Amino acid sequence: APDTSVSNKQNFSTDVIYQIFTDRFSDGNPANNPTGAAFDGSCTNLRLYCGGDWQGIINKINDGYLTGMGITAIWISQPVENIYSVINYSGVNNTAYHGYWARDFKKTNPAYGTMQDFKNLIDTAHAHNIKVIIDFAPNHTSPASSDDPSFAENGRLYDNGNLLGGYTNDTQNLFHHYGGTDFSTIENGIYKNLYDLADLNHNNSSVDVYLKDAIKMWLDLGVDGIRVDAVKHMPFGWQKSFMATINNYKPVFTFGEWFLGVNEISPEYHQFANESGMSLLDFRFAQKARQVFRDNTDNMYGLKAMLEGSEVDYAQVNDQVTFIDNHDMERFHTSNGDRRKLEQALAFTLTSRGVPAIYYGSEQYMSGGNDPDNRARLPSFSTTTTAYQVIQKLAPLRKSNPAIAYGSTHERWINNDVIIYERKFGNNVAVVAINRNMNTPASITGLVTSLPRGSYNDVLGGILNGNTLTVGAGGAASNFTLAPGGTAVWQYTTDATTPIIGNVGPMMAKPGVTITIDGRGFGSGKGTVYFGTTAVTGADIVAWEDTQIQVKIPAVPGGIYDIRVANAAGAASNIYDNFEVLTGDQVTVRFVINNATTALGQNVFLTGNVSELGNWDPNNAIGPMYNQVVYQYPTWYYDVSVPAGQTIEFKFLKKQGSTVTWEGGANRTFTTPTSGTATVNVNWQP
Ligand SMILES: [Ca+2]
Ligand SMILES: [Ca+2]
């Protein structure tokens, strides 16, 4: 199938995502509405149910509202059954309108609909070439007080109707009982409760297997992507086994939310997007975009440096989901704000690298501060606002122009308030000019592009004051003035003759799993896929066409591989690095080591004889290990995804910068479980 087909569940760079809060978009069935103190039909109390549902989203796919905007994927609230309590927090009644307070991950939330309504939503969406991404929030169930079992539903977890346990009297240890996080350390934020949410214990084999079976069920119902909630608050080693369960079963695009603030650059966040097996909501793009286009706390050089930096720091930048606002920040449009600011920032996101997401109601200029004010019911379904038209004109280009879906980004002209950049993929080009200054024209002189000669019409049709670009020989354009608030997009598309890889998905899996490689120039006759120097040809290539190849990972040792494609004529592509072949299926094992005293700046690490453990190299060792909450220093602990069903060898080591101190003695051995979890508890061997 082509890279742009709705069936391509692995990669989303050719798509535009519309993020819907199901309750707040359209009540297409009022008989499923909550009643009593849980419902506010006027949606004036933004913490109660207003009544919006899956039949409401079906109705807006059918009548052309969402397809007339060119949206090709929708991201909806978590579909699973939630607690039914109305919780009063210091006066206000609050409900699970948002889907985050789960009680059964194997059944639907009846306010949104029945399982038949969920299947009709998947079928209607796909029949209209729309992909469906759902929230999944495995870090917790719901508000709970072990001291007061009558509060809310006491964090109870059920499995397809059957009660597994509650937060009070948790003799099975399904949940963590360490108090609540103060956010001071990454460790602290993982093992203590978020606010009052009953924190799931993924080291318990029952919780582990349950969540892994729950996600597979939703995969069986045809969802196309997963947005994972609170990834900074779950063990990284457990999320790696969770991604390995998705990818080795039915790989679909998965991305998580790790909030970053303005000017926060964090190593940990990038490490997560590069090594977890999932991508991130690109808060580094969003905060810088709001600084330049909304708040004017930085200018175009900031924007340039963020685009140039992020292409390097994210190993797979075409997989990060970009946005200018969402459910966790104030709406981009303000009361006293110019609409042009929103319209430009949206045209910027739609032509930028990554996977653009548009928060519902952006096309209707909704304002509102933080939660719950940014989740009002959307006021109108007008298809004639300037913003609806911008999206309508630009969102198609992700499907037709591979330079917008996969291309590199190149700054071509810049000053404090204008950036003109080029997106380039083989021979396909898109050039975008933006003047953020609303009252001063910009004189453009000396702009060189990669567009061939011709008079390129603005794809926006002049609605944000864009102009035609005349390009002469050598990509040089005639000089022009960019209007106050001017935004124009110019484009040229043709064939590549060369193989060029734009995206690969999944990026982590065991031998035998079919991966999807997307790009242009592969040709129609089946060529060769290289993993390292290993060549895969013939029957192991499941599908070959010019924009997409599906191929089985070969039986190679586990580790990090470079992918390359050769067309049938022997021409080879660019290298798509950092693919992780796993040793096999994964299980999370908790490693606990006692009596490992260290010095300031010295920390404990784990390594061993499989790739998942860094194959005995100190620079790739797992850690630094934790030592505050579940166990305390000098006992250190860590949850590590390791291959299932086999004997591994390993040793612990101390690292103070440059210096590595290995444990003495023989190597440790452990035979891993086939499913579930296990705990290794050993003592530092001098
Ligand atoms: Ca309803
Ligand atoms: Ca947690």
From Swiss-Prot:
Q: Which positions are annotated as binding Ca(2+) 1?
A: D27, N29, N32, N33, G51, D53
> Catalysed reaction(s)?
Cyclizes part of a (1->4)-alpha-D-glucan chain by formation of a (1->4)-alpha-D-glucosidic bond
Q: Which CDD domains match?
A: AmyAc_AmyMalt_CGTase_like, CBM20_CGTase, IPT_CGTD
Q: Where is this region: B?
A: 139-202
Which residue numbers delimit the IPT/TIG domain?
499-580
The segments labelled A2 in the record are 203-406
**Annotated site (Transition state stabilizer):** D328
- The active site of this protein is located at D229, E257
Q: List the disulfide bonds.
A: C43-C50
Does the record bear Disulfide bond in its keywords? yes
Question: Where would you find this protein in the cell?
Answer: Secreted
Mention any Pfam family matching this sequence. Alpha-amylase
Chain sites annotated for binding Ca(2+) 2: N139, I190, D199, H233
Q: Where is this region: C?
A: 407-495
Per its Swiss-Prot or TrEMBL entry, what cofactor is needed? Ca(2+)
Organism the protein comes from: Bacillus sp. (strain 1011)
Q: What is the lineage of its organism?
A: Bacteria, Bacillati, Bacillota, Bacilli, Bacillales
Q: Which domain of life is it from?
A: Bacteria
What PANTHER family does the database record attribute to this sequence? ALPHA-AMYLASE 1, ALPHA-AMYLASE FAMILY MEMBER
Q: Segment A1: which positions?
A: 1-138
* Residues engaged in binding substrate: Y100, W101, H140, N193, L194, Y195, D196, R227, K232, H233, H327, D371, R375
MF terms from GO for this chain are:
alpha-amylase activity; cyclomaltodextrin glucanotransferase activity; metal ion binding; starch binding
Q: Supply the name of the protein.
A: Cyclomaltodextrin glucanotransferase
Q: Where does the CBM20 domain lie?
A: 581-686
Q: What's a single GO CC term here?
A: extracellular region
